[PDB]
Each structure stands twice: as C-alpha cells, then as structure tokens.
Subunit: 336 residues, 5 copies
C-alpha cells in the first residue's frame, strides 16, 4: 500500500509544519485559462484558472532506492495538511468534478509537495460609466489565507512576475483585454491581525468607432438636415412646418432607440448630453421660423391696413453652424 | 493529537453550556463585505458578510505552559456545541467552500471560543413605488436563534453600535446607500415563547436629475411646442392640422418609450399622471383649432349667403400657459 | 448522554407507532412567512412557510424528576420515526441549511413530540386570462402523506381554521392577496387506496385603474380625435387625408406598444377586441371621406361638362358617436 | 427488526434474480402529473410523472401467519437489487426529496415487489416552424434500461395501452395537448447489443384565430387602404404623395412590431412571405402614381409649348384587387 | 459475493497497471447524442455524449468455467483504478444520476475492462462576427488526461476515424451542422511535461436567404423609392419635401428595428456599412432638391427684379443609380 510508506497514523496532521517555530513559506503559481462572462449591471466577472501550491513537509518523507515521485488524487487531501486559500471579494465559486475531482498531489522523496486544482471563481468589480463610451475600467483578483496570519504562514509569488501565464486566445465579446501584472500588499484585520494578499490586475477597453457610428453620426446628420429650412422661401408654410415637426419626431425616435440599446445604468452620461443638446438645437430651429412667420403676417396686415429674405434667416444661417461647431469643440476638448 | 487535549469523549456536547442554570450569553459581530444585487420586481436584495460569535465554555479548557491558542477548521464543529443562528425572512443562502469550508474556530486556554464563517444571504424587502422616482426605501436584515428561547440563550451585540463595519467601496449601480445602524427587539412565538432578534438597517435613494432629464424635459418641450399653432394664421389649415397630429404622435411615442424603460410595476405613479396631463393638454390644443376653423367657415358661408385674429386664439394664448403653470405648481407642491 | 435516556437500540423505529392497531393521528400547523414570486407564463408560484407536526409515541418516554423537556436537532431524525409528508403538484422544493439544518425536535416526558422545519416550495396553478385585465384567479397548496393510507395514518388540522397564520406584511408587486382559508378532502389512488389531503386557499386580484389609464384612455382619445375631420371643409384634401393616415399610424403604434408590454399569452383577450374595434372605426373614418371626395369630383365634372356641407358628413357626425356609445354599452354590459 | 425477516446478509444482491437463466420480466406503469414548461428556442419540454416497477424476487420471501405486506422507504434500496431505468435523450432530471426521498417499496409475502418514485425530467424535441403559425408538432418520451440487454432484462408495458394515465387538468399556456398513446420498439447498440425501449407520444397545436387577428388582419387592411389613392383627383399631389409614404411607414412599423413578438427562429416562414408581398404591393401603389404625375406634367408642357381620369388609374382600379385576390387564393391553397 | 472473485484486498489500486514499466494504452470511443444550446454573446456551446474507455488489467482476472462476463455499477469505481479523463477549456459539466448514476463497468475473464458513462459538458468557442451574416465558425471539443503524462498513460482513438458516431437527428435552431472529424495533437506543460490530447471538430453555417430578405430588401426598396422625387415637378414643394423627410424617418426606423433584433456584439459589421451607405444616399437625395429649390427661387427673383426640367434633376437621374450599382458591385465583390 502506497499510503503505508508515509507514516500517516504516526503524525498529527491538524497542525501546520514547523509548529511553534518560524512561519512556513508557501509559493503560488497561477495560469489563467479563459474569461467566461462579464456583467455590467451587477459589476462582476467570471474567470477559470489553475491554482498551484509549493511547500515542504518533512513528515511526508519516505525512503526510496531511486528519485521517482508518487502521485495521489484528491482522496489523500483529507488525511494531510493543505493550505486553506480562498478568494477575497468573491460571490460564488466551485471546483470541477468531471469525471472526477480535478485535484492532484505529487510528493517528492525529501518531502516537497505540489498541490494543483482547477477552479472557477466570480469576483466583484466596481465600475464607473461617467465617461461612457470612452471609459476605462480596471479589475483585480485577490488571494489570501483564511485562518493563518503572517506569523504562521508566509505567502508569496514563487517566481515574481513570471508566475502568471495567460492563454493566447483569451478574449471578450465587447471588451479589449491588456496589461496583465501582479502585485502584493499586506492587509490588517482587527479581529486576528495581519495577512498577506496577492493581486492579479488587468484593464478593459471598448470599441470607439462602433459607438461613434451608431450614435454620433445620426444625431449630427439630423442637426445638419434641420438647417435646410433656412434656405427655403418663407412663403411656403406647409413645407416649412412639417419638415421641422418631422425632424423633431425623427430625433425623438432616434434618442429612444439609442437609449433602448444601452445597459441600464441610471445616471447621466456624456452621450445623453450630446443628444439633448442636439434636441434643443432642433427645437430652436422651429421657434425661429415660427417668429419669422408671425412677423411677416404682422407686417403684411399693417401694410394692408395702411392703404426678399428676412434678416432672421440671414443671421441664423451663420449663427447656428458656428454655435454647433463651438459646442463640439468644447465637448471634444473636455472629454478628449 | 490536538483533539485529545480537549476531553471530547468525556462530555455530552448535545446540551448547551450551563444546562439547568442561567442563560449563556452570546456576542455577535458583523462585517459587511459587499452588496451583490437588488431586484425591484421580486423585492429582495443580496448581501455577503462575515459572521462572528463569542461565548465561553469551561468544558473546552486545556492545560498549557503558555498563553498560546489552538486553531481548528470546520471539521471540529460536528464534535462540539455551536449556536444555531439563522436569518429571518430569507429566501436562499449558502456558505462558501472554496477551496475549503470558510469556517474557523479558535479556543483559548480558559475556554473562550471564537467562531467565524463567511455567508451570502438573500432577504426580502417590501417596497412602495407610489412616489417614484422620488421614493425612499428602507431595508433590514434580521438574525435570530432558531431553537433556543431567551431563557436558555441570550443574544446581544458585543460592542453596541461599534459591532457593525462596512467596506469603504460598497456601492450599487442605480441606488445610493447611507445610514447604517443596528437595533434590537424581542419577538414572541405562540408555539415556543420569546426570542431575541437583531437588526441591520440602511436606506436607499435614487438619482433625481437623470430621471428628470430623461422624462420631464421632453414632455414639457412638447407641450410648449404644441402652443406654436396659436401664432400661425388661421387660413393655413394644411399647416395647422398636420402640426397638431404629428405632435400627438410624438407625444404618444415618447410616452410609450418612457413606459418601456421602467420596471414592470402595475400601479399608478406620479410620472404617469404628469404624462397623461400633458397628453390631455395636447389633445385640447387640437380641439381648439378645430372649432376655430368650423366657426370661420360658418361665418364666411353666412356672409356669402347674405350678398384679423380670432378671439379664441387671443384668449388661448394666455389661458394655456397659466393653466399649465398652475398645474405644475400644484404638482410640485404635493410631491415636493 | 441524552440519547441513552431514550432506548433507541431497544426498539425498531422502522415501523409506525401502534403498528397492527388503529391509525395514529397526526396534527399539522402551518405559518406562512412570505410569497416570493409568481410566474404567469409558466403558471406557478413560490411560498416559504413553517411546517409543524404533532403526535405521541410511548417508546420515547423517559423518566424525569421534573417536567422539563429535551430539545434535539435534525441529527436525531434519522434514528426515530417521523411522518413522510410531501407537497402535491409541486415542481421544486428544498430545506434551508444555514447555518445548519432548520430542523427542531422536542420530546415531552410522556412521549409527546413536536417536529418543526422551514421549507420553500413551488407549486403549479392553472390560470385563465380570458377576462384580462378583469380576471380573478384562485390558487391552492396541498399536503398529503406519501406512503401511508388513512388506515395507518390519520391527518387533520390540529385547531381547525385556527391552524393557519399569515404574516402581516405579505404582499405581491402586481397582485392583491385576500381570503385565506383551509379545507380538507379525501383522495383515491387505484394503486394503494385512499389518502387524506389538506388545502390552503387564497385569491388574487389586479389593479383595474392602472390598466384602464394605460390602455383604454389612449384608444378612446384617438377614436374621438378621428372624428375631427367631419367638421373640416371638404375642399381641403391635403388637410383631410394626412390627418386620417397619421391617425391610423398612431393607432397602429399604440396597439403595438400595448401588445409589447403584456404577458405572452397566445389567445384572444377583451382588450384586443376593444383595440381592433377602434382600429376598424378609424379605417371607416377614412373610407367615408374617400367616397365623399370621389362624389364631389364626379358632380363637379358633370356640371362642367353640362355647360354647403355634404349629406354624408351630416349623417356621419351623428352616426359614428352613437354607434361607438352603443358598442361601449354592450361591451361593458358583457364584461361588467 | 423488520430487515432481519429478509435474509439480507445471506444473499448476493449485486446480481439480477434468476442469474444464468431466462431473462426476468419487468412491468412499468406511468402516471403523468403535469407539464411544466416548453422552450421553442432550445426545443425541449419538462414533465413531472410517477414511475412504477413490478417484478418478482424469491430471495425476498419471508414467512407470515397472514397476508399483510411490509412497506419500506428509500433507505432499503441500497441493500437490494433494483432496475436501473433511465430516460433517453434527456437533458436534466432529479428526484424530489421534500420532506424526504419520494421512494416507496412494498414487498409481498411470496416475493412480489412494488417500486415507485416521483421524478421530473427534461427531454429534447426537434421542431419545424416552416408552416408557422399553422404547424403541428409531435413529441416523445423514452424509457430504456442502461446496462441490461434483452437477454437479461425484459421490459414491457404491464397493461398495454391502459398503463398510461394523465391528469384531468393538464394544460399549456400557448399549446393544445391531445392524443396520448404508447408504443414499443427495439434499439441496437454496436457496443453491447439490443435493448427494449418504450415511448409516450402526444401532439401539440396552436390557436389559429389569435395569430390571424394579430397579423393577417392589419396587413390586409393596410393593403386595402393603399388603394384609396386611385379614387382621388390626380391634381392633388400634396394629398396623393403623403398618403402613400405614410402607408409605407405604417406597413414598415407593423412588420417590425410583428417580428418583435415572434420567437427568434432564423429561417423563412409563410407569414413573412405574406407581409413582404403586401409591402411590394404598397410600393407599386406609389410607383404607379409617380409615373401618372410624370406623364401628366409632360403632356401639359407639350400642350403649352404647342401654343377626366387617366387610363392608368382606370386599369389599376381593376388590376390591383384581382391580383391580390389571386395571390390570396394561391397562398391559402398551398398552406391550407 | 461477486466482489470476492476479484482479489480487491490483495492489491494496491492507487497505482496504475504496469507501474515502473511501459505506459498503459487506453482507447476512447465517443458517441454524440445531441446539441443542447449555443450562446453567441458568451461564446460557448453545450453537448451531451457517451464516453467509453478500453484498457486491460491483469489484477482483475478471475477464474471461470465459461466465457461469461460480470457487470458492475458505479459503486465499484471507488475500489479500482480508472483513468482520470477531463475536458479542456470547459466551463461546467455534470454526470446524470437519474434514477441512479449512469456508470457501467464490464470485466472480462482475462482482465479486459469496459468503462462507460453519460456526461453533459459546456465548452468555450471563440467566434468572429466580422463577416456577419456571411460568417463561418469552427468549434472543437478536447479530451486530455489530468495527472498522467505520455510516459505513464498513452491515449489514442481506438478505431481511428470510426470511433466517432453522431445521432441522425442532431440539429440546431439557427445553425447548420456539418463536417464531423477527429484529430490528435501533443500538448506541453512546463510544470509536468507532455500530454496527449484529442479533438472533435465541426462547422456551423447560417441561413443566408432569411437575413437577405429581412435586411437587404427593405433598404434597397427604400433607396429606390427615394429616387421618385427626381420625376416630380419642381414647383410642388409641399409634395417634394415631406416625401424626403418621411423617407428619412422610415429609413431610421428600419435601421433601428434591424439593430434591435441582432445579437449584442459591439463592433462594426458589413450589414451596418450597407445600411449607413443607404442612409447617406437618402440624405443626399434631399440636399439635391434643397439646392434646386434655392436656385430656382434666386433665378425667379432676379428675373422679376430685371423687369422645363432643371439640369440638376436630369443629371441626378443618371448619376444616382449608377453610383448605387457601382457600390453594390464593389460590396458584393469584397464580401462575396
Ligand atoms: C411674438 C412672436 O414672434 C411669437 C411667435 C411664436 C411665439 C411663441 C410660440 C410658443 C409659445 C406660445 C405661448 O402661448 C407663449 C410663449 C411662446 C414661447 C411664444 C412666444 C411668442 C412667439 C415667439
Ligand atoms: C361646433 C364646433 O366648433 C365643432 C368643431 C370640432 C367639433 C368636435 C370634433 C370632435 C367630435 C366629433 C363628434 O362627431 C362630435 C363631438 C366632437 C367633440 C365635436 C364637437 C363640435 C366641435 C367642437
Ligand atoms: C365609388 C366610391 O365612392 C369610391 C371612393 C373610394 C372607393 C374605395 C377605395 C378603396 C378600394 C379600392 C379598390 O380599387 C376598390 C374597392 C374600394 C373599397 C373602393 C370602392 C369604391 C369607393 C368607395
Ligand atoms: C418614365 C416614368 O414614368 C417615370 C416616373 C417615375 C420613374 C421611376 C422612379 C423611380 C426610379 C428612379 C430612377 O432614377 C430611375 C428608375 C425609376 C424606377 C424610375 C423609372 C421611370 C419612371 C417610372
Ligand atoms: C447654396 C445652396 O444651394 C444651399 C441650398 C441648401 C443649402 C445647405 C442646407 C444645409 C446646410 C445649412 C447651413 O446653414 C449651411 C450649410 C448647408 C449644408 C447649406 C449649404 C448651402 C445650400 C446647399
Ligand atoms: C514585483 C514586480 O516586479 N512588479 C512589477 C510591477 O511593478 C510592474 O508594474 C509590472 C509591469 O507593469 O511588472 C511587475
Ligand atoms: C372546516 C371549516 O370550518 N372550514 C371553514 C370554511 O368552510 C369557510 O369557508 C372558511 C371561511 O370562509 O372558514 C373555514
Ligand atoms: C400496442 C397497442 O395496442 N398500441 C395502440 C396503438 O397502435 C394505437 O395507435 C393507440 C391509439 O391510437 O392505442 C395503442
Ligand atoms: C487520422 C485521420 O485519418 N484523420 C482524418 C483527417 O485527416 C481527415 O481530414 C478527416 C476527414 O476530413 O478524416 C479523418
Ligand atoms: C443657438 C441659438 C441661435 C439663435 C440665433 C438667433 C438669430 C437672430 C437674428 C436676429 C437679427 C435681427
Ligand atoms: C386648459 C383648457 C384651456 C381652454 C381655453 C379656452 C379659451 C376659450 C376662449 C373663448 C373666448 C370667447
Ligand atoms: C359605424 C359605421 C358608420 C357608417 C355611417 C355611414 C353614414 C352614411 C350617410 C349617407 C346619407 C345619404
Ligand atoms: C400587381 C401589379 C399591378 C400593375 C398594374 C399596372 C396597370 C397599367 C395600366 C396601363 C394602361 C395603359
Ligand atoms: C452619389 C452622389 C451623386 C451626386 C449627383 C450630383 C449631380 C449634379 C449635376 C450638376 C449638373 C450641372
Ligand atoms: C466612422 C463614423 C464616424 C462618425 C463621426 C461623428 C463625429 C461627430
Ligand atoms: C470638430 C471636432 C474637433 C475635435 C477637437 C479635439 C481636440 C483634442
Ligand atoms: C437637468 C434637466 C432638468 C429638467 C427640468 C424639468 C422640469 C419640469
Ligand atoms: C414651476 C415649478 C415650481 C416649483 C415649486 C416647488 C415648491 C416646493
Ligand atoms: C359608457 C359606459 C357605460 C357603462 C355601463 C356599465 C353597466 C354595468
Ligand atoms: C378573427 C380575425 C379574422 C381575420 C381574417 C384575415 C384573413 C386574411
Ligand atoms: C380568399 C380566401 C380563399 C381561401 C380558399 C381556401 C381553399 C382551401
Ligand atoms: C429573397 C430576398 C432577396 C433580397 C435581395 C437583396 C439584394 C440587395
Ligand atoms: C448587383 C449585384 C452584383 C453581384 C456580383 C457578385 C460577384 C461575385
Ligand atoms: C448636465 C447636462 C445638461 C444637459 C442639458 C440638455
Ligand atoms: C431661436 C431664436 C428666435 C428669435 C426670434 C426673434
Ligand atoms: C389619478 C390620476 C388621474 C390622471 C388623469 C389623466
Ligand atoms: C379647448 C376648448 C375649445 C373651446 C371652443 C369654444
Ligand atoms: C371575436 C373578436 C372579434 C374582433 C373583430 C375585430
Ligand atoms: C364608411 C361608410 C361610407 C359610405 C359611403 C357611401
Ligand atoms: C420565397 C419568399 C419570397 C418572398 C418575396 C417577397
Ligand atoms: C406599377 C406599374 C406602373 C406602370 C407605369 C406605366
Ligand atoms: C468603415 C465603415 C464606414 C461606414 C460609413 C457610412
Ligand atoms: C447632392 C449634391 C447636390 C449638389 C448641388 C449643386
């Protein structure tokens, strides 16, 4: 029996190795397999990865006539001491068990142990959509020991920045992924004391041109088309008025359609500001002609009682495009 | 063996400490980690937190030459007595088990015990949307002992109002969170008797300006634009009529779009009342011109048979804005 | 050891108490905690409640010098006999296990036993939406013994109609809840025989005014607005025709919007009948003017070849509102 | 002890009864309780039913002074031999365990055994939507032994066509259920050999009138309304053109609304063909008037340079309705 | 007892057969039962299949007077050595357990073992929608040993390309499935070494004609209809302008409706490019008439101050269709 080579019954495996002494160092290696999904409304993401642990235990040493190691499955885990790692700020997680538990243990003749498992974890990530769709988001995944402080367990990256590996085909449907790196930081808990924590960082970006073409182009086209009425004879009211009202209807429908396709985030965004400014411009384009018609009627009535192009149109043809250009310049200077 | 220092086999751990005597006090400490999601339709919320318990048991005392404590995992829980805490008015809950059960036990040499676990719980919360979007909601989380009355178990907050800690980065996508505090109250059950209950309270608020800009602004703009026809010559019917009918179409589309983006709550809200009042105003703006046209035709026909501005327009230009202003004043005085 | 006071090893707990004799009566007490959700498409509802059982077993009697009882958790259930209650016509259910199994057992000195647990159950409920939104629905929850007939187990309500208690804050988002009561009835199974069954009944109602304001008001407004063209001079075709076609467009958009916000139930409802009748009225309002224009053109052409208000408008002004009123009277007389 | 009457330890229950001999017959009885849901996109359905088994085992015979049988729960299943039935082409399934496992065993004195359980199963069902909404679908549920061929286990319906019972209140929200019957057929597996399989068949149908009223009626009304322009004087261009363009807009909106409410099945259906044919008719109704206006302008210009009803309208008034009627006749002759 | 024929207690089943020697070959056979669903947003698919293993173990040999084999269920798996196969790049998976574990073991008298199980697995699949709806996608399912390298376990297809079988009725709602084949490739892991991997490949295709009819036909019809205004007299402004603005409104509504029914993939697709090019054409069709009207007014005003068809229309009638045809030719030449 292979379990009789290791004196399982001759030691107490409820205590950590080197108990009463210096803290036992543990190395951690992480390989990211894929990114499964991301939720903007709930602000979380899902990841599947490989977790590996490295430590030495002299109580597991066994004599051997060669340098061959023994491999055991997850059934041996309940009989020996293993680190109790857990993910901080996680929502749900589980370990694959098809067709059996994805747990592997390798024991070297001097007592070096390799512990590997496959896990899927969902973690939270606070997001800010103030600069949508030009926003940039940062995410992090955290690993920490649950019950052992820094005085008993010392956690560190085994090979520094080389301990993180990612798949060549990792991708997301609506985001771009870049800048993977790892960091470390100490955390303090008033109940028990200080703990070591590890971080895995990456950045997310969007596709600017798709949003530009889908949103900004129709609004600017509609704003430019609303300026057509300044070049039509003022005597054609049944052509001037329905053009304006139909432009207002089309702008409203476009705004509703744009709002229907964005994630349900309930605060003000820059795209909303752009669209509402265009709506206000369209509304003023109709008020202008209304006052021009009223003035023309009043002048005609006075002239009749007594017995060319109106300047408002001339000035508006210049004022409206300059104001819109100035607004665009300021808007693109603030939001880059 | 560490489990032999504690005389596990020499006591009956099916009874509470101090059985037949005064009730054993138990302290509780709560640290909130994050808020996961909130459902307005089903009226519930999800929370992840740390639960800690404090009590003393003399049967767990062990001799020692120093003041060092022993730490055990969740496997010891089945062999000793632990409080049976549960969440009142909860829908579903579970305990994290990655990579192992998130349960920790610490035993002091005199018999003081610390019991900690990580849990995620979903709880109900009745909401009222009568004042939407200006409504305010209050939520609560309740903790109570399942099988032990106040005569056997005494539950209390260990440090009063200082026993509640929240994360610095707790946030929700569409709500603002404030005013965390704790309270206590006794509950009575006719089957078994009185129980102690603890509460954790917080308040939720919305973003007023986003809803204002998205809903009230287009309706007021459309109402003001419907008033343009009072300033147009009454002789231009093919300009007067299509403007009104297209304004009605645009108002209907706006109302439908607004209704399509709100949570499906099936009772009357103030925003609905505002929108329908605007719709009624728009409808009357068309009936007015209809009667003005009919009167003008009748007068012309009589004048022809026998062989300026109509007063209705003059009076409407004053009546309509005053009535709308009065309605807005009353509406904003009632709903603040 | 408390389990040694009861002679667990001295009896066979695989048989019911009083085996070979009269049937053992069992009382049941139910307390409803909340209603979680309701699905109209799948026709089911979710409920969380407390289930309590009462019976007497002389084999559990223990000597005592006082009148104090012993309390045990769910671990004792596997060693003694308990009733095998189950929910009829249920889809899924589970028992809460946070932080431990919500199972309590109390044993009196003479052998009276109290068995309580917390469960969440989802049950089916056939619905009829023929009278939507004026429909009324009735639901029921059923409890029955799985393996014991009426000859071996007698099930009944312990205190009649007083055995049902509901929370003061039970509510649903889109329904009104009323009329809680309990009934009993015998069921027959050809495979094994007769069984006792218990029922818990309640009724559901909707908010009539919300649906009225959201649906009936716009259709009646549009129908009334379509009548405006009867009062306009027949000589203004470019005002008469676009008004009708835009009214038809607005009615179609309103009907589509109304259909988009109702539950996906694929059969005819009264609201559909109302909306389609309004659509037919709107269509006829356009056919009338079409024939009036054709007649006027034919008369003018004949008069020219040879070298006031048309009666159709006069009669329609009276016919259309009377017919609509008659239809509304019949419709509201049939559907109340 | 009741388990000592049966010599559990004196036989090997890892082999089937009558091992080395003829195959042991097993009868199956099925009672359908309800249908839970159906998914058109994923092509599956959910069912809850009772499964019963009948067989004889002489090793379970026990002496008795009467003809009374013994009843056992699911805990006895692990100690005796039971058939390993499973559902073919299933996606997910589970056995109810509230408040305990819904498993019952009854043993007769001669060794006849009754085995019953309550299960919920989801099974696949290929569907064809080519004839939507006039399509008809057939579904089936299959039962087969997993590890025993026909040489060792003989599976059959115990009472032929009488072994299937359905609830009186089984129904679906959007489908009609009819024609329940059972069949049998042999299946061959190259790895192990031949197996017996059972089938349970039923048919699904839709509500024709609801779809007719919701889809075909508006399209035919719009097509008929587009014919109004043939009866209007050709001199009124500002009445002729906006009517056509608004009819095209209304047809497009209706088609979009109809497409938004159907299940997302990505291939051509007959309703689409009907709607697009109506759209083509509407488009031609506008091209006709365009050419009529162009011809009239050319004739007027020539007549002026040199110094009634146009036949196109006359012929179109007859051609268009006949062509539409012919198309409807062919369409309703092909699709019944 | 059948388990006593095999000397279970006389061997150590924690080591592979032939330990210290050459690697033990293992054959694998796969039968695909159905495809359950596919998610375009999350880029994954679900499959249900049969997994079979073939290997020889001399420690399981038993004497026999004939050539009959013994069959065991999943309870024997924990007592013997089995291959630890797992799926690479998988998200979630489970083994059916209704009514019992779907695990079968057959042992031949010389020691040949057959191991079969039923599993459902979800696997990732990167997709590219640049050529939507004319895109083609390839998927793969991978099988590999978790803890054994190629030096200890040799994995291969038992019968080459004949080891893969698919159901005759495998289908997907919106995809066409073809070209099933298997391949093998070696993978290298820096932590442990080289492993054998197996692949199962298939291809997916869409229905071109459905997308063509639903998207390209309305846009081309609208573009052609926008050309009607070139044939109308330039003196009819109230007919020329509303036609253009309503065509723009209809194009916008069509684009919004088309975007609302596609999967939410946030980058540019060819259909978007086609639709926006049509929108630009429609916009230019209105700018042309605007300038034609302005020129005509200026000429009339000059002629009046001093005291036929405009060439722009003539040239546009030829230019617009040629440019659209050229664009279609280039577009269909690039995207095939
Ligand atoms: C004096 C004049 O050129 C008229 C023409 C259109 C008119 C406006 C139409 C819309 C509003 C109508 C309301 O009754 C009074 C304020 C508003 C804003 C009017 C103010 C006076 C205007 C500008
Ligand atoms: C007498 C008069 O100034 C006419 C012009 C428009 C007319 C209304 C048009 C809509 C309705 C038509 C219906 O046939 C009678 C009631 C309604 C409400 C009419 C009442 C009489 C009005 C107000
Ligand atoms: C003779 C007459 O007053 C004309 C004016 C409008 C015409 C109708 C327009 C719509 C239809 C057009 C079709 O071509 C013939 C039937 C339909 C229904 C016509 C029948 C004859 C009508 C009623
Ligand atoms: C000659 C004539 O009666 C004209 C009037 C409307 C014209 C059509 C308008 C739409 C198209 C415009 C395009 O420029 C040429 C082809 C199309 C299809 C035209 C062909 C010639 C027509 C039919
Ligand atoms: C000179 C002339 O034929 C006029 C008629 C319509 C005019 C255009 C209308 C839309 C725009 C209005 C804006 O105010 C100036 C640029 C734009 C693009 C105008 C440029 C000059 C045009 C083309
Ligand atoms: C411990 C260590 O070397 N950390 C570095 C980090 O400072 C740097 O930012 C990153 C690349 O950006 O590489 C890693
Ligand atoms: C057994 C019994 O008393 N049942 C009654 C029931 O008949 C009555 O309908 C209900 C109140 O409506 O109260 C309860
Ligand atoms: C074995 C047997 O009798 N099967 C019949 C089947 O042939 C028939 O179609 C059905 C009723 O339609 O009743 C059952
Ligand atoms: C090992 C082997 O024979 N593989 C072949 C593969 O090369 C070929 O592509 C496929 C059919 O396309 O059939 C299989
Ligand atoms: C963005 C708002 C532009 C308003 C332009 C008004 C131009 C008025 C000209 C009056 C000339 C007498
Ligand atoms: C909000 C309803 C306003 C109605 C205004 C009617 C004005 C009628 C004037 C009649 C003058 C003779
Ligand atoms: C609801 C349908 C009403 C139809 C009214 C027709 C009125 C025709 C009057 C003819 C007078 C000669
Ligand atoms: C369905 C297409 C109908 C087209 C009808 C054209 C009628 C043209 C008449 C020409 C008479 C000279
Ligand atoms: C696709 C853009 C087509 C633009 C056609 C302009 C035609 C101008 C003709 C001027 C003749 C003097
Ligand atoms: C590729 C689309 C570009 C749109 C530019 C919009 C600038 C306001
Ligand atoms: C009209 C667009 C101007 C953009 C300026 C951007 C300056 C960073
Ligand atoms: C920031 C938007 C303000 C809109 C005010 C609406 C008042 C009715
Ligand atoms: C026109 C807006 C008036 C708002 C008054 C608010 C009084 C609390
Ligand atoms: C016009 C509404 C009439 C309603 C009558 C209701 C009779 C019960
Ligand atoms: C009950 C609605 C009938 C609609 C008939 C449509 C025939 C094309
Ligand atoms: C105009 C409808 C004709 C329907 C014919 C149906 C022949 C089976
Ligand atoms: C079957 C529909 C064909 C549509 C062709 C569209 C070509 C741009
Ligand atoms: C007008 C459509 C042309 C299509 C050409 C396709 C060449 C492969
Ligand atoms: C701060 C956003 C203002 C938008 C006004 C239309
Ligand atoms: C939009 C401004 C109009 C000013 C009329 C004098
Ligand atoms: C109580 C709300 C009334 C709304 C009327 C339009
Ligand atoms: C909207 C009121 C109109 C009154 C006509 C006299
Ligand atoms: C039975 C409903 C008929 C509806 C006709 C519009
Ligand atoms: C709507 C009926 C019209 C009748 C024309 C004579
Ligand atoms: C085969 C369907 C053709 C549809 C043409 C509009
Ligand atoms: C729709 C056909 C029109 C033919 C013009 C000659
Ligand atoms: C690259 C796509 C360009 C689209 C311009 C309308
Ligand atoms: C669309 C181009 C118009 C050119 C006017 C000269």
């Amino acid at each position: 029996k292979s379990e009789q080579l290791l004196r399982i019954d001759d030691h107490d495996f409820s205590m950590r190795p080197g108990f009463g002494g210096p803290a036992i160092p543990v190395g951690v290696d992480v390989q990211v397999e894929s990114l499964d999904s991301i939720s903007e409304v709930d602000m979380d993401f899902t990841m599947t990865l490989y977790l590996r642990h490295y430590w030495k235990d002299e109580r597991l040493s066994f004599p051997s006539t060669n340098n061959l190691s023994m491999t055991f499955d997850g059934r041996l885990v309940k009989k020996i001491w293993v680190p109790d790692m857990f993910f901080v700020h996680s929502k749900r997680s589980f370990i694959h068990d098809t067709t059996t538990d994805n747990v592997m243990l390798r024991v070297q003749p001097d007592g070096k142990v390799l512990y590997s498992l496959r896990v899927t974890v969902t973690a939270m990530c606070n997001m800010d959509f103030s600069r949508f769709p030009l926003d940039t988001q940062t995410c992090s995944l955290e690993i920490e020991s649950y019950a052992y402080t820094e005085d008993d367990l010392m956690l560190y990256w085994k090979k520094g920045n080389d301990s993180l590996k990612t798949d060549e085909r990792i991708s997301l449907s609506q985001f771009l992924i870049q800048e993977f790196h790892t960091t470390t930081k100490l955390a303090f808990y008033s109940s028990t004391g200080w703990y070591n924590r590890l971080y895995i960082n990456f950045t997310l970006r969007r596709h600017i041109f798709f949003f530009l073409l889908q949103t900004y182009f129709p609004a600017t086209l509609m704003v430019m088309l609303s300026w057509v009425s300044f070049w039509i004879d003022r005597r054609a009211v049944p052509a001037r008025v329905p053009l304006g009202i139909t432009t207002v209807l089309t702008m409203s429908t476009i705004i509703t359609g744009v709002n229907a396709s964005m994630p349900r985030v309930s605060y003000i965004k820059a795209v909303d500001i752009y669209l509402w400014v265009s709506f206000v411009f369209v509304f003023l384009s109709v008020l202008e002609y209304a006052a021009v018609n009223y003035l023309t009627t009043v002048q005609e009535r006075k002239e009749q009682k007594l017995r060319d192009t109106h300047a408002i149109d001339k000035y508006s043809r210049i004022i409206f495009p300059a104001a819109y250009i100035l607004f665009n310049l300021i808007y693109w200077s603030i939001f880059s």
